Amino acid sequence: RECISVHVGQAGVQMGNACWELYCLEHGIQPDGQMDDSFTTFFCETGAGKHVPRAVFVDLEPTVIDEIRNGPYRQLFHPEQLITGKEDAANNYARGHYTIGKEIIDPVLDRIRKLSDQCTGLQGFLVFHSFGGGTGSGFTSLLMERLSVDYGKKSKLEFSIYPAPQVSTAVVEPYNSILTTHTTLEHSDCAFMVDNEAIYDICRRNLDIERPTYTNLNRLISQIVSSITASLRFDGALNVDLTEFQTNLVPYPRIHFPLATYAPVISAEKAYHEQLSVAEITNACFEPANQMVKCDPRHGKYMACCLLYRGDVVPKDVNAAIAAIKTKRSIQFVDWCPTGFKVGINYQPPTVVPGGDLAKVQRAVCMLSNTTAIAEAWARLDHKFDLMYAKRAFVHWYVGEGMEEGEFSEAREDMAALEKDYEEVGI
Amino acid sequence: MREIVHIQAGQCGNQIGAKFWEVISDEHGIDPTGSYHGDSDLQLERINVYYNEAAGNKYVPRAILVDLEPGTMDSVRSGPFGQIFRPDNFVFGQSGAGNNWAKGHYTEGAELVDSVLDVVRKESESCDCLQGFQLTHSLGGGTGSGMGTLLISKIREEYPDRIMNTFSVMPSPKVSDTVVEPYNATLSVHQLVENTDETYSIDNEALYDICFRTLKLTTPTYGDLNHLVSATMSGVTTCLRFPGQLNADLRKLAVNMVPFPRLHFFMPGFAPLTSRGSQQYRALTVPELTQQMFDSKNMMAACDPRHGRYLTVAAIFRGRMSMKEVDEQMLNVQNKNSSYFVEWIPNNVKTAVCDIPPRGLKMSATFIGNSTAIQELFKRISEQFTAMFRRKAFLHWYTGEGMDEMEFTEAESNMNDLVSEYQQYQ
Amino acid sequence: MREIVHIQAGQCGNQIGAKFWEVISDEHGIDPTGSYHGDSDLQLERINVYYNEAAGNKYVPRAILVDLEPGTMDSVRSGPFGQIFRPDNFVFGQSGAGNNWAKGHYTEGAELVDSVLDVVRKESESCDCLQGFQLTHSLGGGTGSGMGTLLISKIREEYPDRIMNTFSVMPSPKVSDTVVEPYNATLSVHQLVENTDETYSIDNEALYDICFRTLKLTTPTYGDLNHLVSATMSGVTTCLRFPGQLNADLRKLAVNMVPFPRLHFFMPGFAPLTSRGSQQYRALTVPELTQQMFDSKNMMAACDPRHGRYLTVAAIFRGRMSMKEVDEQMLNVQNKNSSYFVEWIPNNVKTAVCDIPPRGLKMSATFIGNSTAIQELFKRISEQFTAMFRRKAFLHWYTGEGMDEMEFTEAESNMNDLVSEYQQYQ
Amino acid sequence: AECNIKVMCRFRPLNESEVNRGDKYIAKFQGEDTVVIASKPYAFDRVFQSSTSQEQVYNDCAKKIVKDVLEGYNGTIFAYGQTSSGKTHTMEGKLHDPEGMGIIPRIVQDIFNYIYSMDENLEFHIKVSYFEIYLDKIRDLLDVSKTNLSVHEDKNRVPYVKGCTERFVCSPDEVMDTIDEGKSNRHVAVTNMNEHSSRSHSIFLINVKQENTQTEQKLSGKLYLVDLAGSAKVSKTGAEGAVLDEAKNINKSLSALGNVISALAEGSTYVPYRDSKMTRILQDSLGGNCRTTIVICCSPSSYNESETKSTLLFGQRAKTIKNTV
Ligand SMILES: Nc1nc2c(ncn2[C@@H]2O[C@H](COP(=O)(O)CP(=O)(O)OP(=O)(O)O)[C@@H](O)[C@H]2O)c(=O)[nH]1
Ligand SMILES: Nc1nc2c(ncn2[C@@H]2O[C@H](COP(=O)(O)CP(=O)(O)OP(=O)(O)O)[C@@H](O)[C@H]2O)c(=O)[nH]1
Ligand SMILES: Nc1nc2c(ncn2[C@@H]2O[C@H](COP(=O)(O)OP(=O)(O)OP(=O)(O)O)[C@@H](O)[C@H]2O)c(=O)[nH]1
Ligand SMILES: Nc1ncnc2c1ncn2[C@@H]1O[C@H](COP(=O)(O)OP(=O)(O)OP(=O)(O)O)[C@@H](O)[C@H]1O
Secondary structure (H helix, E strand, O other): OEEEEEEEHHHHHHHHHHHHHHHHHHOOOOOOOOOOOOOOOOEOOOOOOOOOEOEEEEOOOOHHHHHHHOOOOOOOOOOOOOOOOOOOOOOOOOHHHHHHHHOOHHHHHHHHHHHHHOOOOEEEEEEEEOOOOOHHHHHHHHHHHHHHOOOOOOEEEEEEEOOOOOOOOOOOHHHHHHHHHHHHHHHOOEEEEEOHHHHHHHHHHOOOOOOOOHHHHHHHHHHHHHHHOHHHHOOOOEOOOOOHHHHOOOOEOOEOOEOOEEEOOOOHHHHHHOOOOHHHHHHHHOOHHHEOOOOOOOOOOEEEEEEEEEEOOOHHHHHHHHHHHHHOOOOOEOOOOOOOOEOOEEOOOOOOOOOOOOOOOOEEEEEEEEEHHHHHHHHHHHHHHHHHHHOOOOOHHHHHHOOOOHHHHHHHHHHHHHHHHHHHHOO | OOEEEEEEEOHHHHHHHHHHHHHHHHHHOEOOOOEEOOOOOOOOOOOOOOEEEOHHHEEEEOEEEEEOOHHHHHHHHOOOOOOOOOOOOOEEOOOOOOOOHHHHHHHOOHHHHHHHHHHHHHHHHHOOOEEEEEEEEEOOOOHHHHHHHHHHHHHHHHOOOOEEEEEEEEOOOOOOOOOOHHHHHHHHHHHHOOOOOEEEEEEHHHHHHHHHHOOOOOOOOHHHHHHHHHHHHHHHOOOOOOOOOEOOOHHHHHHHHOOOOOOOEEEEEEEOOOOHHHOOOOOOOHHHHHHHHOOOOOOOOOOOHHHOOEEEEEEEEEOOOOHHHHHHHHHHHHHOOHHHEOOOOOOOEEEEEOOOOOOOOOOEEEEEEEEHHHHHHHHHHHHHHHHHHOOOOOOHHHHOOOOOHHHHHHHHHHHHHHHHHHHHOO | OOEEEEEEEOHHHHHHHHHHHHHHHHHHOEOOOOEEOOOOOOOOOOOOOOEEEOHHHEEEEOEEEEEOOHHHHHHHHOOOOOOOOOOOOOEEOOOOOOOOHHHHHHHOOHHHHHHHHHHHHHHHHHOOOEEEEEEEEEOOOOHHHHHHHHHHHHHHHHOOOOEEEEEEEEOOOOOOOOOOHHHHHHHHHHHHOOOOOEEEEEEHHHHHHHHHHOOOOOOOOHHHHHHHHHHHHHHHOOOOOOOOOEOOOHHHHHHHHOOOOOOOEEEEEEEOOOOHHHOOOOOOOHHHHHHHHOOOOOOOOOOOHHHOOEEEEEEEEEOOOOHHHHHHHHHHHHHOOHHHEOOOOOOOEEEEEOOOOOOOOOOEEEEEEEEHHHHHHHHHHHHHHHHHHOOOOOOHHHHOOOOOHHHHHHHHHHHHHHHHHHHHOO | OOOEOEEEEEEOOOOHHHHOOOOOOOOEEEOOOEEEOOOOEEEOOEEEOOOOOHHHHHHHHOHHHHHHHHHOOEEEEEEOOOOOOOHHHHHOEOOOOOOOEOHHHHHHHHHHHHHHHOOOOEEEEEEEEEEEEOOOOEEEOOOOOOOOOEEEEOOOOOEEEEOOOOEEOOOHHHHHHHHHHHHHOOOEEOOOOOOOEEOOEEEEEEEEEEEEOOOOOEEEEEEEEEEOOOOOOHHHHOOOOHHHHHHHHHHHHHHHHHHHHHHHHHOOOOOOHHHOHHHHHOHHHHHOOEEEEEEEEEOOOOOOHHHHHHHHHHHHHHHOOEOOO
């Protein structure tokens, strides 16, 4: 059992630098490249007393790549795997897909082929990017389309950072997100999502960090993506694999948008005063403001829900906790899936980074759940897109790259097809 | 990796260009002789983005100084950082233009433009992969507007795909040190509106207005004015000169700020702008900086933004800071002032930050704004041109070089068009 | 948390405002340079309620000094605590008002009021959550009554929900250092009676009357008068600057003292007031303090309360003390003197105490009283205005600024109305 | 004073690349004025079916335009659509054949045939020009030396070309000769969708100046014949290398005039003609003293259903436009 990953954009490599430092300290891998069947999923055996991750950080702009080469984690990652481009995507879906995308996929696509040939138990793929930019939108759809036609049957665990409702980093991110989702709607099996102001709200209230940064945001994100793959690494009472995320969460092949959340988030001084059990954290993850997306779950209905625990959590009190969620009428489940619960447990507990913002806890939980609540966000993104599309704003840059007005209409109607599917399935 | 070819045209362009290499040399820690004496290793990470490597660990700048008056080069060469430039790049004529756009564009420029194209071709092919062109000129005069705008046309013909960036100072009616400003102004914007992808509209009176209120210099010279505008030149190209948590290249700034091919005339700004007698009484936290960035009186253009609506704005921060306080300041600044922002765009702000601030300051940022208030400058410039053109005043000197009066009318046709273009989106 | 924006208008307002920051700086233990050198940790608990944090552990005050005479700021800036204030807050004109309400309200104030509104907006948005405005002015003169009352009207328009507190000194017939006092007085109370929620009526002759009997200073200056009135400014805002067993915010004082929207003109007082030659012969226990608080001659207003009836009174104590002796003193003080208290209210007294007394004193309190005896001041002020207005004396200077004589009559209509309002409840 | 721009449509038969893939014939016609596509009517002035020959399209569309441009007004005809829609065959065709020849030789032949029918005293001065906008440069095809021309304004602020090779012509056969050598110099590339893919916009001008000797009344009319390229998708064409640069400049132009039609349809204030320099040529056609007639071409295959629907609604936005004639 093994799995490979590729990181795209500033959002990907910043999570890439933050997640692989977490994976190395879990398995006792020192940052100099060296220290049985626990690290074989992500890390390889480089002859004798040396390891290499199964990672390929790709990015067109070279500032992030050489910083990793001149960073602290020099000897861990392969120097050849750290791919760098020549010219930035420049916040454009077309530029990272046709001009700069086509001339760099050929080094990239053949690399993941031979990097998979040395492996034998490749379960699937997981990517890291953000559709708010150019390289995260154009190049990501290109490679994911280029490998889906080759492999197809293997899974694809997308991790995209969508823009917030009112907070935003760019101005043309509806154009970047609406075009790349036209290709991602059919090829991606599942895609977990993260938001900007929502994750700031997590560390503001519970973790009381009044001045956080992206370095702190990626740590708890690393706890999420490391905890979902913690079942295949360490032994568990109920082992789950990456293929469970396709069967239990995707009721229809074109409705493949779960939410993401994590608990318990608690500081050092607050950890010793707050009680740690499954009952209080089971209510915390279902709390609406404790999610990683500004979206009201009370408005919609949960299509499916998955739970994955860590640490010394016995199966008694965890089953009594979810039974209290069923009779709690604050949230409402859809009639099309009454038994929409997938429980998981791993024995290895949540770790802690030296000097990190999160505290050590003897147990944790991460919930991924499909719901019809995210239709209003697509309505919001589609609504604001019509305001700029009516004035033809920021269009001359895309057609200057090689595109036209036609596929903008395809990107509009394809999201319009998604809304009528979300209101139909939500009946 | 993504080299930028610098080209200093005109008298003022050589001054701010000379100050531009001065202020960034302290950031990279380069001696005036050309050797490195810095402290950080990241200064050498992206020293090639502006400089070229040479023997003895010497770094010559990729600057091309062009001017039709040899006395200007003697002052730049005899400056503090005058010896670091390449002697071969100092190409220049002998006879000045005398504040005539026709002389520096048709006759006096045409004899020298064959000499400068072979020089910039050397710096272009010598690099690994060129990104764009960072030019400095003035819309007034003949050598800045005539010859500086000419090579913009030739570089567009040779390199139509690269970015054409211009830091251009422009005249105003309150402060006017030249009689032929509106004729030179209206002829220059005809070329800048069609060829260049991005331009920064800097008004000279606002350089004096900002130094009274915030900086309160009692004896300001032109060198003090060059310092604050050259900081903006360092802010726009900070993301590729040093690493950052959210890098924005010059092309990444273009797509967010240039919603239409003609509407690319920006309005720069910079902060912190505080005197020495009031530095201790100010907090370097970002909310005190954000209110100064979007302030109506902080920018280096005299157009008041409250009389119009912002089309799109960008703020490139510098220094280690918290992103939540940075991002949330962009929320309340636009929603509380929704009248001064267009409703047909959901988010007008573009964010960017770097981990390496300027030397001597821990927190700083640069304000970049494309607003519809800039048409007020095009209004007064157009009325000054139409007031002098309607009786053919000061045109017989231009006809001596073979220039036709229809080109002045064609420049006048472009003036009201771009004025009406900004009025469409307000 | 509940910040208070200070605004020093007029000459006297700058003096008592300068003394106000002086006396509280010793309580918080702030150096004149701006650094902290105190002893208690509670001083930093609520230092942000008046000051703003800055680099180097320096605390700049949130003071906005406004005046139409630049010589006043030179004396305040060159004072003991003059260097701690922000230089940007020192906004001021050049030409004085010359004791004319029309000049400082219509012409001389209107050119500067655009400049001060952008300054107070900076201090208002920079805070976490503003509570109110602590203003100091004088009803005499033109810059205090004209421009000071003007921005009260503008702040009411922008912040109608916040508290508008004013420590206003007012003239009297026995001591009158200005001829145009009743004209400036009657025009100022027209704005204070409608806009402000609370006001402290301080009479200048009572500042001299209290220093003869109790303090017996042989050579009193204006600085000695500023010390006793500034202590009252510290007493009103003690509950939110330090913890206490029964905290009363400025809004909590307003609802108890302002029974009707117009009847909010208070009568301050302070104790202990004892000379150095009689300090050893006095007991600091509360009954000797309580009889001094409600004394007819202790207050800083010349209106004798025995000629009327108290509408409502508040006493904010300071220092560690016993509550039974405090509360029981409020019982016998009102029932023994039931003729001097209204029978249509069962309890006129409001209690409050703090655990942190002033430096150098273990027991202290401030007397705050809304009494119907204040109409005697409005009687004599109205008769002085009607005596000069009935033949249009000293009005032609006001008409030069475009002011109408009907506004003087409208101010006269407000004067007899509030006089009759106090007479209704006596 | 005001005349509506005539909007006509034409569908073609399925070419060799579409019938072997198995595309369905979705083109459904209802009379002459309107066409039904996916149960959606689209009203036009005249819709041409697949069986419409070359001569039938010319007599229906551009027959009266020859009379209008000779009366004293201006004329302009251009074709909008996607690649392989049949724009080149409609206008160019095969020039040397009587039947297979397109519109632009038929326009030439009708002008000279009309002059022979007129009296001898009407003296005609016809001068021809031919250039193309390729890689954002106006390269002349009549002369190979100059590769970029300027666009200057005339007396009434109407933009037009300067420096171009204005060949004074006498006989109609000479006009056929300069058209043949011009098309031979045309940079025609090969792609998967069309071997004869015109990768740029060929503008052909016929500046017909005329004056009567008796009345001494001078008249002129600018007759623009524009044959634009196709707004093709990169995934369908499979473009790579130099052809990508050719796709950029054509897509800027069709998107630029797409803003002009939407600006003129919704009735904007500024009407941004100055987005692309190709749009600067078509100012007098859309907002001048001209009688414009747009003829959109589309394919009946199901594989190009999205781009063809965009072309029809683009035609609907063109119906609400009026000239200042
Ligand atoms: N902020 C600064 N502005 C300057 C400086 N020098 C000139 N100027 C301003 O720019 C205006 C015109 O720019 P120039 O001095 O360069 C005139 P130019 O050299 O281009 O033509 P000629 O000298 O006649 O050959 C000028 O009138 C000033 O208002 C300077 O050093 N700093
Ligand atoms: N208790 C104090 N009273 C003062 C002091 N200075 C002045 N005054 C009294 O206040 C009266 C008027 O107040 P001001 O001195 O401020 C006159 P203002 O500055 O507002 O107008 P102009 O000076 O004409 O511009 C004045 O006649 C005094 O009776 C002082 O320092 N302390
Ligand atoms: N949460 C989080 N988001 C990030 C981080 N870094 C980048 N992003 C996201 O990335 C978005 C910008 O898109 P990018 O793909 O990173 O753009 P870029 O890397 O600057 O490259 P260009 O698009 O060419 O300008 C922002 O809106 C962020 O939300 C990060 O470290 N943490
Ligand atoms: N109406 C029609 N009837 C029959 N055949 C046609 C028709 N239109 C086009 N064709 C065929 O298509 C071939 C080439 O098509 P054409 O070059 O016109 O495509 P196009 O879309 O105009 O290309 P471009 O994108 O360069 O404009 C011709 O050789 C011709 O046989």
